[PDB]
Structure 1
Amino acid sequence: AQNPNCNIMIFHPTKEEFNDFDKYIAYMESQGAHRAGLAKIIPPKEWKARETYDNISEILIATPLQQVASGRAGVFTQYHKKKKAMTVGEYRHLANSKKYQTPPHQNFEDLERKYWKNRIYNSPIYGADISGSLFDENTKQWNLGHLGTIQDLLEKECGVVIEGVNTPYLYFGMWKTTFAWHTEDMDLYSINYLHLGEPKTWYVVPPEHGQRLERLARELFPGSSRGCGAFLRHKVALISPTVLKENGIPFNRITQEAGEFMVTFPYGYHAGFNHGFNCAEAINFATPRWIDYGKMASQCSCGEARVTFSMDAFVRILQPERYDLWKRGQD
């Protein structure tokens, strides 16, 4: 069995190997990359996402989100307070202000220490989940707006045509902006490109051990667990690496830098934080190997998770017994 310790793997495809996206994901899996839940892909030196980032300041962040924490430094939840609209140029100036900017630090490990010590005492503002793309239309390789759609994959594998669309999302971050522990909708893959700015640190639990994270989460967030049998779908709970280690939960960590891709694999729980002002683009995708994960994915039906239009068909076709309850939670 390849990668039996479930380490995060880093790949350096050549320009020739960068042509065929599906083939390269399958290659990474042949080497055991999925066992980690997360892989890094460094693009060939010949490749670029677009020519420059000099003309992005007028993008609008319609609903910036202030991420307010509750709990203790290593075990906390966050809620999202809506703020007034602002442009990316305005948000960049805010991220660089004395109130929000990255503190002085020695290296990524010192900044990680400072994150976990101090995150709860601040409320950073995240420009998340903005439909759109920063890839040039002429970029033909690993262009996250030109991937094969999940609806087409389900049709190819299973024979059933379904409604829905699959487009990318932009994320504008600042110091301490946080992504809570989660797997993707329907335990899909995700791919994330860091277009510009400061790094993003990731934590991930191997898919084979995801239920160990779920059991810890139920212990640590006992009111939330009574409320919903899949409350990590709410995307609000944080648990630090120190707490994971104290509780014996297998995990790994890695820092993504500008110009690098990350892929999350089906049922790979992940969480993390941004180092300073940055912009990322991400999208969900599927392969043949996903179908069995989609059929077994948990679902939130309490009403909290609320998701896109396109998840309806995935539940309806892959999980017909669960459909009626899940749809009630959507309505």
Structure 2
Amino acid sequence: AQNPNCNIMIFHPTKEEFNDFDKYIAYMESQGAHRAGLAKIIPPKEWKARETYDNISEILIATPLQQVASGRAGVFTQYHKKKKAMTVGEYRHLANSKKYQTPPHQNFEDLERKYWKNRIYNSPIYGADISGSLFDENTKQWNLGHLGTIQDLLEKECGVVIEGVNTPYLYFGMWKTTFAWHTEDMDLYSINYLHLGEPKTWYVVPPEHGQRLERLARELFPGSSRGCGAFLRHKVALISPTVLKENGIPFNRITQEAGEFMVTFPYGYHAGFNHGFNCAEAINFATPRWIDYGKMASQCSCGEARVTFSMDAFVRILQPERYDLWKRGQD
């Protein structure tokens, strides 16, 4: 069995190997990459996402989100307070202001320490979930706006033709902006490219151990757990590495830098934070190996998780027994 300790693997494809996305994902899995829940892919030196970022300040962040924490430093939730619209140029200036900027630090480890010590005492503003792409249309390799769609994968594997679309999303971050512990919708893959700026630190639980994280989360967030049998779908709960280690939860960590891709694998729980002003692009995707995970994915029906249009068909086809309850939670 490849990668039996479920370590995060780092890949360096050549330009030739970068041509066929599906084939490379399957290669990484042949080497056991999925067992970690997360892999890093460093593009060949010949590749570029676009020519320059010199012209992005006019993108609008219609609904910036202030991430307000509650709890203790290592076990907290965050809620998103909506803020007035601002441009990326305005958001970058805010990120760099004395109130929001990255503090002086020695190295990524020192900054990680400071994040977990101090996160709860601040409320950083995240420009998350913005439909759009920064890949040049002429970038042919690993262009996250030109991937095969999840609807086409389901149709190819299962024969069923469904409505829905699959487009990328932009994320503009600042120091301490946080992504809570989650798996993807319908336990899909994700791919994330860090276009520019400061790093992103990731934490991940191997898919084979995801239920250990769920059981800890029920213990740590007991009111939330009574409210919903899949409350991690709400994407609000944080648990620090120190708390994970105290409770014996297997996990790994890695820091993504500008120019690098990360892939999350089906049912790989992940969480993390941004080091400073940055911009990432991410999209969900599927492969044949996903179908079994999609059929078994938990679902929130309490009303909180509220998701895209395209998830309806995935539930309807892969999970018909659950469909009526889940759709009530959507409505």
Shared fold per TM-score greater than 0.5: yes
CA distance in 2, matches of 1:118, 1:303: 31
CA distance in 1, matches of 2:211, 2:62: 36
**What pairs up with 1:299-310 in 2 under 5 angstroms?**
299-310=299-310
Quote the offset at 1:169 in angstroms: 0.0
Runs of 4+ in 1 over 3 A off after TM superposition: none
Quote the offset at 1:302 in angstroms: 0.1
Deviation per residue, 1:2-31 (Å, 9 max, x gap)? 000000000000000000000000000000
CA distance in 2, matches of 1:215, 1:57: 43
Deviation per residue, 1:182-216 (Å, 9 max, x gap)? 00000000000000000000000000000000000
Deviation per residue, 1:235-294 (Å, 9 max, x gap)? 000000000000000000000000000000000000000000000000000000000000
Residue aligning to 1:70: 70
Note the aligned Cα RMSD (angstroms).
Answer: 0.1
Quote the offset at 1:178 in angstroms: 0.1
Deviation per residue, 1:137-167 (Å, 9 max, x gap)? 0000000000000000000000000000000
Matched, 1:36 2:36: yes
Quote the offset at 1:325 in angstroms: 0.1
CA distance in 2, matches of 1:282, 1:103: 27
**What pairs up with 1:253-264 in 2 under 5 angstroms?**
253-264=253-264
- Amino-acid identity (%): 100
CA distance in 2, matches of 1:116, 1:160: 46
Quote the offset at 1:133 in angstroms: 0.1
Residue aligning to 2:54: 54
Q: TM-score, normalised by structure 1?
A: 1.00
CA distance in 2, matches of 1:173, 1:75: 22
CA distance in 1, matches of 2:58, 2:23: 37
CA distance in 1, matches of 2:88, 2:257: 20
Q: How many pairs were matched up? A: 331
SS in 2 for 1:255: strand
Quote the offset at 1:120 in angstroms: 0.1
CA distance in 1, matches of 2:55, 2:12: 29
CA distance in 2, matches of 1:228, 1:222: 10
Quote the offset at 1:318 in angstroms: 0.1
Quote the offset at 1:121 in angstroms: 0.1
SS in 1 for 2:100: coil
CA distance in 2, matches of 1:205, 1:52: 35
CA distance in 1, matches of 2:51, 2:320: 46
CA distance in 1, matches of 2:273, 2:57: 23
SS in 1 for 2:123: coil
CA distance in 2, matches of 1:58, 1:187: 34
CA distance in 2, matches of 1:59, 1:9: 34
Residue aligning to 1:90: 90
Quote the offset at 1:227 in angstroms: 0.1
Q: TM-score, normalised by structure 2?
A: 1.00
**What pairs up with 1:86-235 in 2 under 5 angstroms?**
86-235=86-235
Quote the offset at 1:330 in angstroms: 0.1
CA distance in 1, matches of 2:121, 2:283: 31
CA distance in 2, matches of 1:160, 1:93: 48
Quote the offset at 1:98 in angstroms: 0.1
Quote the offset at 1:32 in angstroms: 0.1
SS in 2 for 1:209: helix
